Structure formats: structure tokens, C-alpha cells
A paper describes a structure:
Jasmonates are phytohormones that are pivotal in mediating plant responses to various biotic and abiotic stresses and regulating plant growth. The first crystal structure of OPR3 from tomato (SlOPR3) showed that the enzyme crystallized as a self-inhibitory dimer in which the L6 loop, a critical loop involved in substrate recognition and coenzyme binding, from each protomer intrudes into the active site cavity of the other protomer. Based on these observations, it was postulated that the formation of the self-inhibitory homodimer represents a mechanism for regulating OPR3 activity and, thereby, jasmonic acid biosynthesis.
Author numbering: 10 to 283, 301 to 384
The structure:
């Protein structure tokens, strides 16, 4: 079984290739990690398994969802440590994903009622909505096109957050540069309409993610930094003329950062919008570990690793309804269906840790 052939990811010896994709669950009440999170990850932690946490705020402006966790305050760090310990107790590797939603926010999630920051002033279209604290759907407001100096301050938030993540005990961090959020708002030419050093040409559009990746590498080391991107996705009006070209531009800058740093990154993570060729082109271009995600199943994951299309495969949806997805895949057991209705609720058990095992 290819998915169970050991894999060496930096200084981490993984026992299998089943990775936990980052998934927002809104159980971190008031943005503070809760005991529920400890059980949730513990139930699904496995010896030599790699897990990626839900997106975590890097500033009081990095939120666009309700009750999402953070790593910018000493309180949050204290609670994450308790969670990290339970995950390590079971022998799993866990990376903390730093998440800034950019323009994908709302006044209710912006301290002082200020508009969410982004690369452009164009708001996400009406066909997309945001989850409000009371469960209703809200309209995305007009964002503010940040100045060159604030980009440096956002980058600083990633750096400080990565350091905070290490203080909490995480084995590393993952940069959330996909699904139309802040970093993706700079990468996609359908959004980035800047006329300065960060807009226009692909090289300019990729500058932001480059500075962010460089900042975290200089804080905790490239071996403990993963990068997630999505060259072709329509989420929150994040489109690009040539998705492949954009993906290859990011990959090219990641390979260069590794050469200049003298160490490879932890991995490259690309989510699919499920041609096949888009994924294979980046994997062949990236000099390092490649993780694939999006619409993968037990059979589809095995084929990707056996054919050399990816080194690790992360599962999202199937790891919500299947706490023991790793074991199930090993035995080819039936997989449980998920109830989307409880994806973003606040119940510490119902739809979170109540899913039956084998
Ligand atoms: C409820 C839910 C929350 C998610 N949260 C995030 C997130 O916070 N960050 C992210 O990059 N992707 C997030 N995703 C996308 C998943 O990481 C993944 O790409 C998707 O679930 C595809 O999984 P699959 O391969 O099992 O079909 C989320 C998906 C779901 C269903």
C-alpha cells in the first residue's frame, strides 16, 4: 500500500501519507482554543501522522469566519500548548496554518468596524457570502488597498505568529495562500489590480507570498514551513487568466527561496478544484515534497503516490466524518458520510467529536 510507505518530511519521519487538511470548524470560541479542539485532534491523531490545523489568525484582522482560533496573543498560545501536547502524546506531527482572510471579512469581524484590508478595493461579488455570528449570511464589504508599508506589517504578523506557533509546541507552520484569501488576493490577476511594485506582472503579484514565505523561513527554518496554494479556483472571485502560469511562478519562487536559504521547505501543498496536468506540472517543477488535496479518495490517493504524482495526500471532508480515516484506508473499510449542517457550528461534540470510529 503506497499510502503507508514511510516518508521523510524534513526532520519528521512520517509513518504514512494520509495528511489532515486544514479545515475551519469554528469551535475555538472567542478565537481562543477550547478543550473540544484537544479531543477532536486527539481522536484523529496517529503515530507518525501529519496533521494541519484549521486556519489560525495572525492578527485581529485575519478573521472572516466565526469563532476561529488565533496565535497572536499569549492567551491563545497557552491554550494551543495544551492541544499540541495531546497531539504529540499520540505521536503525530502537526503544523499550524496561519490564516488571514483579507477582503473575505465583514464589519462584525473587524475591530473598530474598519473595512477589511486587501490588495485592491474591489469587493467580493454578491454571489459569495460570509457566515455571520448568528448564522446568517452577510455581504462582503469594500476593502482597502493597503500601502506598501502595511504589506511589511502583514508579513511581520506572519513572522510573529510563526514564532508564537513554535512557542506553543507546533512542529511547524503552513502558509495559507489559497482559496481567495489575503495572499491569494495578491496572486490572482483577476483581483490584484495594483499598479505599484506588488501589481501588474506575475513577478509583482508573487512578491507578497515570497516575502511571507521568506519571513517565516527566517524565523523558524525552511524545514518547518509548508506553503499551500490554489492556481485554479473560483472561490471568492479569485481567478487568474493562466492558472498554470501563476502556479509555476509561485513554485519557481519557492525553489529559489530554498536555494538561497540552503534548505528545502517542509512541503508544497496544492488544492484542486475537482485535466490532471495542472497538478503534475507543479509537482515536477517544485524541488521538494508535494502534497495534493481536493476530491481524493482511498483509490485516488494510492494512485497519486504510486505514480509519483505526490508525496503526501491530505484529506478534508472525509476526515470530518471519519475520525480513523487512516485506519479505514489501511483496511479499505466503509467511510462515513459527513453532515455539512454542523461544519461551522459551535457545539464541542455534536458534529465535531461525536463521529463514530470503526
Ligand atoms: C468545513 C471545511 C473547512 C475548510 N477550511 C479550510 C481552511 O480553513 N483552510 C484551507 O486552506 N482549506 C479549508 N478547507 C478546504 C479543505 O482543506 C480541502 O481542500 C477540501 O475539503 C477538499 O477535501 P477533500 O480532498 O476531502 O475533498 C475546508 C473545507 C471544509 C469542508
Amino acid at each position: 500500500n503506497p499510502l503507508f510507505s514511510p516518508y521523510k518530511m524534513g526532520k519528521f519521519n512520517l509513518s504514512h501519507r494520509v495528511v489532515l487538511a486544514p479545515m475551519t470548524r469554528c469551535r475555538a470560541l472567542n478565537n481562543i482554543p477550547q478543550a473540544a479542539l484537544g479531543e477532536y485532534y486527539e481522536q484523529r491523531a496517529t503515530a507518525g501522522g501529519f496533521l494541519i490545523t484549521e486556519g489560525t489568525m495572525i492578527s485581529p484582522t485575519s478573521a472572516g469566519f466565526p469563532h476561529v482560533p488565533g496565535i497572536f496573543t499569549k492567551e491563545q498560545v497557552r491554550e494551543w500548548k495544551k492541544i499540541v501536547d495531546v497531539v504529540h502524546a499520540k505521536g503525530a506531527v502537526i503544523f499550524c496554518q496561519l490564516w488571514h482572510v483579507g477582503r473575505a471579512s465583514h464589519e462584525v469581524y473587524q475591530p473598530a468596524g474598519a473595512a477589511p484590508i486587501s490588495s485592491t478595493e474591489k469587493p467580493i461579488s454578491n454571489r459569495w457570502r460570509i457566515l455571520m455570528p448568528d448564522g446568517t449570511h452577510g455581504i462582503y464589504p469594500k476593502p482597502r488597498a493597503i500601502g506598501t508599508y502595511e504589506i511589511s506589517q502583514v508579513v511581520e504578523d506572519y513572522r510573529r505568529s510563526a514564532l508564537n506557533a513554535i512557542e506553543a509546541g507546533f512542529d511547524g507552520i503552513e502558509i495559507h495562500g489559497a482559496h481567495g484569501y489575503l495572499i491569494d488576493q495578491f496572486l490572482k490577476d483577476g483581483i490584484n489590480d495594483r499598479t505599484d511594485e506588488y501589481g501588474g506582472s506575475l513577478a509583482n503579484r508573487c512578491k507578497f507570498i515570497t516575502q511571507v514565505v521568506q519571513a517565516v523561513v527566517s524565523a523558524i527554518g525552511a524545514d518547518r514551513v509548508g506553503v499551500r496554494v490554489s492556481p485554479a479556483i473560483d472561490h471568492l472571485d479569485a481567478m487568474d487568466s493562466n492558472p498554470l502560469s501563476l502556479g509555476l511562478a509561485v513554485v519557481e519562487r519557492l525553489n529559489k527561496i530554498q536555494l538561497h536559504s540552503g534548505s528545502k521547505l517542509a512541503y508544497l501543498h496544492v488544492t484542486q478544484p475537482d485535466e490532471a496536468r495542472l497538478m503534475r506540472t507543479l509537482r515536477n517543477a517544485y524541488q521538494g515534497t508535494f502534497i495534493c488535496s481536493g476530491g481524493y479518495t482511498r483509490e485516488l490517493g494510492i494512485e497519486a503516490v504510486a505514480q509519483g504524482d505526490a508525496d503526501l495526500v491530505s484529506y478534508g471532508r472525509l476526515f470530518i466524518s471519519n475520525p480513523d480515516l487512516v485506519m479505514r484506508i489501511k483496511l479499505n473499510a466503509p467511510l462515513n458520510k459527513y453532515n455539512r449542517k454542523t461544519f461551522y457550528t459551535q457545539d464541542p461534540v455534536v458534529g465535531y467529536t461525536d463521529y463514530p470510529f470503526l
